[PDB]
Amino acid sequence: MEAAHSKSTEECLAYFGVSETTGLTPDQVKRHLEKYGHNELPAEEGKSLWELVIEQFEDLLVRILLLAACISFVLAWFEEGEETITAFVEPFVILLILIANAIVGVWQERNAENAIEALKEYEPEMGKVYRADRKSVQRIKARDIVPGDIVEVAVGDKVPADIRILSIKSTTLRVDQSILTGESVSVIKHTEPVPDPRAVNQDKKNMLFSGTNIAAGKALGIVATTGVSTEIGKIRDQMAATEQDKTPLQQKLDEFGEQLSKVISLICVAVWLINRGAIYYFKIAVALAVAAIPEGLPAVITTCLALGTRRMAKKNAIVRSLPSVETLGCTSVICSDKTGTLTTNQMSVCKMFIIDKVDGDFCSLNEFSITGSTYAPEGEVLKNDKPIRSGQFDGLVELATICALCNDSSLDFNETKGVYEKVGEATETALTTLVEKMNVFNTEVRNLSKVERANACNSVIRQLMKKEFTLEFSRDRKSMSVYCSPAKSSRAAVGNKMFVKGAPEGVIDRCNYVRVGTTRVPMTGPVKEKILSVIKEWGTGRDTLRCLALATRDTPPKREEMVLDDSSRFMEYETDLTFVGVVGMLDPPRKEVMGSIQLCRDAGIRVIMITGDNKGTAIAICRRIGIFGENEEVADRAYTGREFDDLPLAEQREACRRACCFARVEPSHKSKIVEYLQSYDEITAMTGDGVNDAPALKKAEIGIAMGSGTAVAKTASEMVLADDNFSTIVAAVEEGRAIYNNMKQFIRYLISSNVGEVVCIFLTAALGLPEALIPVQLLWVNLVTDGLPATALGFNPPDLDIMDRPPRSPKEPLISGWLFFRYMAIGGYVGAATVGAAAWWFMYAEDGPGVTYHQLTHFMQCTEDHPHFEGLDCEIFEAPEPMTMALSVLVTIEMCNALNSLSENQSLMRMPPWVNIWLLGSICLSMSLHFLILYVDPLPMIFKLKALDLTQWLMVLKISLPVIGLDEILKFIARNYLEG
Ligand SMILES: CC(=O)C1=C(O)N2[C@H](C1=O)[C@H]1c3c[nH]c4cccc(c34)C[C@H]1C2(C)C
Ligand SMILES: [Mg+2]
Ligand code: NA
User: Fold this and answer.
1) CA–CA distance from 550 to each of 575, 749, 805, 929 (Å)?
2) CA nearest 428: which of 447, 452, 451, 411?
3) Where do the TM regions start and end?
4) Are the C-beta atoms of residues 782 and 830 closer than 8 Å to each other?
5) Which of 19, 338, 922, 971 sits in a 20 to 30 Å window from 939, CA-based?
6) Would you say 699 is a known binding-site residue?
């Protein structure tokens, strides 16, 4: 049944044709079970590290290396009757590299624990129904509940399905809807229809929502919807939105990988358009692929990311997904939940007042303030910002007495967590904490164990008066009371009191006196007017507190005369009251939240509050934390979920750009707001702690959960602030930007090597030259000998002005303009210095001089034309030395390039090459690995190399060194005649 909240109880009963007193027949159940299915959310699996690996080869860049590996495997099989001992190394290294990258890519996006499994934790396994075949309440599996049957819920129950309330059997039914609202405050349900067909969960006080729980009361209802058609079902559908997405940097990478693939298959149409019977293509096409691809990038990327995570862990931020450690770096909008995120989610009494003195039209109040933002009994009472003893004011003694006695909650020290927690409602525990701070009888608490300290002062008060019974809360009275007698008195004794608490208006009207110290005087208009004026100010400004009036009936009726089983009589028992005091409470901001907001603003980041709580307290908090100015007007800048649902699509979309405060919202509203923000192509984050935050946390580019929040929120996030420090979000942005800067410079360095290896192989094929470099070599170059210095570049002490500019545009490309022209040209000098030396050992070299008129081009004719312009041998092109001189030049050039990459524009004259010790130590590790291929006996075979002379290396150290000057020329023109 749709819109059950908008219908009446009989209308709902009619709709399914059941009686409140027999329920469905097993016939009706079978039919409904068939038509609607079972009462449960479908599980979401999460794929396996098989088809996750399969999805690794799913992109074009590695689709190239897999195709190439097969062609390389064909080349390794059809080997001549020569070096067949280890010619398969080429294809088998590539194939290992692919699987090695495949495993590295999956592992960084970790965590097998499911968000939906955590969500089904809110499904009860058992439910309670009245069905036709039995008189007594049946207890069946919750998954067998069907729309239409009569369900019963009571104290401590998880609600089994979305239910329309039929009759409430207690004086009140109190509900905890925090999974839909993020607020623990118990909600007071009724049975009257809620006409508005677009009412929001908070407005549907005649409904029970599945997965929520019963704080107090007993109720009977009819099931409206089950399974996936519930409010928690909506949350679930948005968790299954596994529409495979990636971070803004990964997309830039994927796009860069797609631009790089349209280079390889563009040089193949270039190579082909220069000229069995074609083994020359499938030999050099493989060399083109291996060359262009900077394989090992993942390794050096992963590492950069890995050290960011590990660095972030020391700041108490746990990054559940490696790439996300950078995301906040380029975030323009941070959406944030309020309760438990921006605030502590610990209701606190921050102000209170009693009457000072009364005189005709003059009335003055003793106002006090109370510090402490937690449930811990630590804090102090101040008058005019100076400390006082609460026990000196008799009115505060009664204030505490009322708060301690008119209370069904208490405080508990959790020894495993080392913190104080509530037991019962937050608003009542605030009263418990208040009473322990006040300590109005000067009980000695300094030396109590923390567990005894929790309720010490409340216990003292409980020793003085015996609570005989509570006139529980009722809707028509908006207040509650407790009937108490002086302990150590007889049933008959006078001195009984009623202690009342409730909504200021109603309570105050039922007062005929005001307490002054231990005296009492008539309530008058001027006195009432004074009281009401401060209650009004306290609950509307930037205070906007929640105020309770506290009163006592000095002469309550005799127990006997009071009829307890009839609550409509409770109001009149609570009359002829004496006003005592007011308390004002709010759930307070975390102390570091304000600072964090300002620093984000300074980094050009927007902060938006999206909360299930109410607009008035949403706005007040926004002012406290700096999202709004204290006096700034916000009519068009703050909205409720329902106001938002009234705006047409375009207006809603614009609202997300204009507004900063969204209140009384539903889980879907949060993801909708994030969705809109993303339609302006803004990189947006979400911060939260509740189940109601999950949808939004998932849809964001990065979801950030609070350490002390819910498991659902945590499993939907990529980052958890274990200690609940909002400051860490600022530090996260800094680290995130440092990461992007690192990648920006080590991609330049590696691709520089890559473009050089491409041009080299484009010349040893268009100039018909002898094989300059081989695939087998390049794989060791790009993964091991180039990877190390690239990984060493990540040990850069970050820029000191990285947090002062705004976030980079999403459309801003990794490398473009001058940087392309830069590495593109360096990739040309390398592509000609490796070709040069490989040809130079064949000409101007004494250890094998060929025809020095460029007649090296013809290697086509060895035994084919030996009587031609020859002079000597045949097996001299496949010599190790040309490849050795080509390799050693490639390697040595990049070692300078590594020293060149220490700065983007500052010269090595102005920035010493001994800044990074990890880089220098990496060049040694590169060298001692490069010379390890030469001297170590079994290695020089596969990589076909041989060590050189003192002069041989001196020609290397003369064709590589003048790369510094080439880059220096690019540095001068950039820093001067370009910009700056
Ligand atoms: C099998 C496997 O998991 C993978 C790989 O083995 N890789 C990456 C890759 O995803 C490849 C890649 C995708 N997009 C880009 C952009 C830039 C560079 C690269 C890539 C290198 C590719 C490689 C080989 C590192
Ligand atoms: Mg919250
Ligand atoms: Na996401």
Assistant:
1) 13, 72, 53, 81
2) 411
3) 49-69, 90-110, 254-273, 282-299, 744-763, 774-794, 815-837, 884-903, 917-935, 951-971
4) no
5) 922
6) no
Q: In this structure, what token pair is assigned to residue 759?
A: 């041009």
Compute the 3-state secondary structure of the chain and give helix, strand, coil in percent, each to the nearest 5.
45, 15, 40
Alpha-carbon torsion 501, 506, 511, 517, what sign? positive
Ligand 1 surroundings by CB, under 6 angstroms? 56-57, 59, 61-62, 65, 97-98, 101-102, 105, 253-254, 256-257, 293-295, 297-298
- Please report, as a single letter, which amino acid is at residue 719: M
What the chain holds in terms of domains, given with CATH numbers, is 12-54+113-240 (2.70.150.10), 55-112+241-331+732-980 (1.20.1110.10), 332-344+589-731 (3.40.50.1000), 345-588 (3.40.1110.10)
Q: What is the CA radius of gyration of the chain?
A: 38
DSSP-derived secondary structure letter, 670: H
| Alpha carbons 449 and 446: distance in angstroms, whole number | 9
* Residue 412 to residues 265, 421, 422, Cα–Cα distance (Å): 69, 5, 6
Q: What is the DSSP string of 16-68?
A: HT--TTT---HHHHHHHHHHH--SSPPP-----TTTTTTTTTTSHHHHHHHHH
Which one of 57, 101, 255 would you pick to mutate in the ligand 1 pocket, going by the greatest count of ligand atoms within 8 A of its CB?
Answer: 101
**Tally: H helices and E strands in the chain:** 34, 30
Q: How far apart are CA 150 and CA 146, in angstroms?
A: 9
Please state whether 231 falls in left (phi above 0), alpha (psi between -120 and 50) or beta.
alpha
- The technique is X-ray
Phi-psi region of 388 (alpha: psi -120 to 50; beta: other; left: phi over 0): beta
The C-alpha atoms of residue 35 and residue 229 are separated, in whole angstroms, by 13
Smallest Cα–Cα separation from 837: which of 794, 879, 788, 882? 882
Task: Residue 258: count other Cβ atoms within 10 Å of its Cβ.
Answer: 12
Q: Is 670 annotated to bind ligand?
A: yes
Dist CA 430 CA 428 (whole Å): 5
Instruction: Say whether 295 counts as a known binding-site residue.
Output: yes
Is 404:461 a contact under the CB 8 Å cutoff?
yes
Interatomic CA distance for residues 183 and 200, integer angstroms: 15
**Is 337 an active-site residue?**
yes
List CB contacts of 815: < 8 A, sequence separation 6 or more: 744, 747, 748, 751, 823
Atom of ligand 1 nearest to the CA of 296: 25
d(CA 261, CA 66): 13
Neighbours of 146 (CB within 10 A): 24
Tell me which DSSP letter residue 808 carries.
P
Return the structure tokens found at 46.
Answer: 């999460």
| Residue whose pair of structure tokens reads 């990739």 in the numeric block | 827
Tokens of 907: 């010269």
Catalytic residue among 162, 337, 693, 724: 337
Length of the chain in terms of residues written:
980
Which SS3 state, helix, strand or coil, does residue 357 take?
strand
- From residue 786, give the alpha-carbon distance in Å to each of 52, 294, 640: 29, 9, 56
Q: What is the resolution of this structure in A?
A: 2.7
Under 8 Å CB-to-CB from 236, ≥6 apart: which residues?
41, 42, 116, 119, 228
Q: Give the alpha-carbon dihedral of 244, 246, 251, 252, to 10 degrees.
A: -170
| Ligand with the closest atom to the CA of 327 | 3
Contacts of 72 (CB under 8 A, 6+ apart): 90, 91, 94, 286, 775
d(CA 538, CA 583): 10
The SS3 of residue 467 is strand
